[PDB]
Amino acid sequence: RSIAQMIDHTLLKPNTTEDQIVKLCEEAKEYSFASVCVNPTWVALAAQLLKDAPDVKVCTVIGFPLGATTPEVKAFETTNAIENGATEVDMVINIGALKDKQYELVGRDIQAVVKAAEGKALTKVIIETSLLTEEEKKAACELAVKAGADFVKTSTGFSGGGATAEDIALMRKVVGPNLGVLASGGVRDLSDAKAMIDAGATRIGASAGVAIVNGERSEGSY
Amino acid sequence: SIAQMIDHTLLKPNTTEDQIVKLCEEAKEYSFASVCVNPTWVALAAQLLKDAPDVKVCTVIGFPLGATTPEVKAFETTNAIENGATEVDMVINIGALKDKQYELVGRDIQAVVKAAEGKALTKVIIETSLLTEEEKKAACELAVKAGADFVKTSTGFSGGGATAEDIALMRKVVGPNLGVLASGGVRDLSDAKAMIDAGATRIGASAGVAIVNGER
């Protein structure tokens, strides 16, 4: 067992350059991370660099990080990403529509991504917990289940807050065993990741994955 | 009237329908240049301001990170225009610019311009807070060659906003042929006037009501 297989090696900064993407993918091969998460402009490069690393998936983000574009654009960006080599996509919900109880639009928005990814990529639904009430977190997860998503995910990392154990337990309670639960945003050390795992997370989104795995190895050394 | 140069902007991820209604009625009251809303709200803003052709509907493209593909930016532009947008603000591929990949930066801008061709103004956000002085110059030059209509300082989601020296640099590059928009950090009339005196022809802000109410 190793925590690295549950970590999405993420780098989504707007000023990210090619040399940083190359290093991220090489780190993913060395540590056997679950995936690399990069912005859609880097999907083609990540897929080429990891073409012989089948256990390391290419993940990208859709309608990210604001989630306030139309369902038609989110589906097009999903299909475009899959053509470029993405096998996982993390979409952001329409938070405003969720605030307005426009549940049919929130679900159709998620379903547009799911339909474009059908049979080709996992879809993770970022509900952006730092912006939701307790009832909205539950409603968003229920819409993700009804839409056929594979994962519910806490945070973009670009909002006010990140993953909390209480949110993860809430999300795991709604989706049960049928969908994965991803803790992202603010997961900085092994203590953070293990707390999310205990709360019910099955995938960790982080940028410090190397420091997290090295902390795991240090528990075995003198 | 400085109101005619202000883009009444509200791009928060948790923005709700009642806030867009308040945004549009404020713009139709003060005759702002435009409202700037995320693409999900374009169709609503276009109908709320159908009887105010002087107030355009502006939306944002590949916003705010600029790190999606040119084909997606073009689709989002075409989709935004179909929904009622007549001005689009796109974010450059910053990583491509920092990597000297000038053909991709220009092709990326070019994709939005061709989608908007004859239907909408294109504003190119160069995100000055992440750019060296030379990259700021190169970004404007690539905007001119691709056929954009404006150069814009900031997305409103970075660590820095418009500065007078940045506005003057961009104005010197594009001259009179393209507009210069100061966005991010402008909160009063004194800031707005400082950007305009530096060469800006459009102001992006959220406190446009407080700015115009200080024109006494």
Swiss-Prot record, chain A:
Its main location: cytoplasm. InterPro entries: Aldolase_TIM, DeoC, DeoC/FbaB/LacD_aldolase, DeoC_typeI. It catalyses: 2-deoxy-D-ribose 5-phosphate = D-glyceraldehyde 3-phosphate + acetaldehyde. GO terms for molecular function: deoxyribose-phosphate aldolase activity. Pfam families: DeoC (PF01791). The keyword Calcium does not apply. GO terms for biological process: 2-deoxyribose 1-phosphate catabolic process; carbohydrate catabolic process; deoxyribonucleotide catabolic process. It is an enzyme of class 4 (lyase). Gene3D superfamilies: Aldolase class I. SUPFAM superfamilies: Aldolase. Keywords: Cytoplasm, Lyase, Schiff base. The keyword Signal does not apply. It is found in: Cytoplasm. Its EC number is 4.1.2.4. Pathway: Carbohydrate degradation; 2-deoxy-D-ribose 1-phosphate degradation; D-glyceraldehyde 3-phosphate and acetaldehyde from 2-deoxy-alpha-D-ribose 1-phosphate: step 2/2. The active site is at residues 90, 153, 182. One of its GO terms (cellular component) is cytoplasm. Belongs to the DeoC/FbaB aldolase family. DeoC type 1 subfamily. Catalyzes a reversible aldol reaction between acetaldehyde and D-glyceraldehyde 3-phosphate to generate 2-deoxy-D-ribose 5-phosphate. This is Deoxyribose-phosphate aldolase. It comes from Halalkalibacterium halodurans (strain ATCC BAA-125 / DSM 18197 / FERM 7344 / JCM 9153 / C-125).
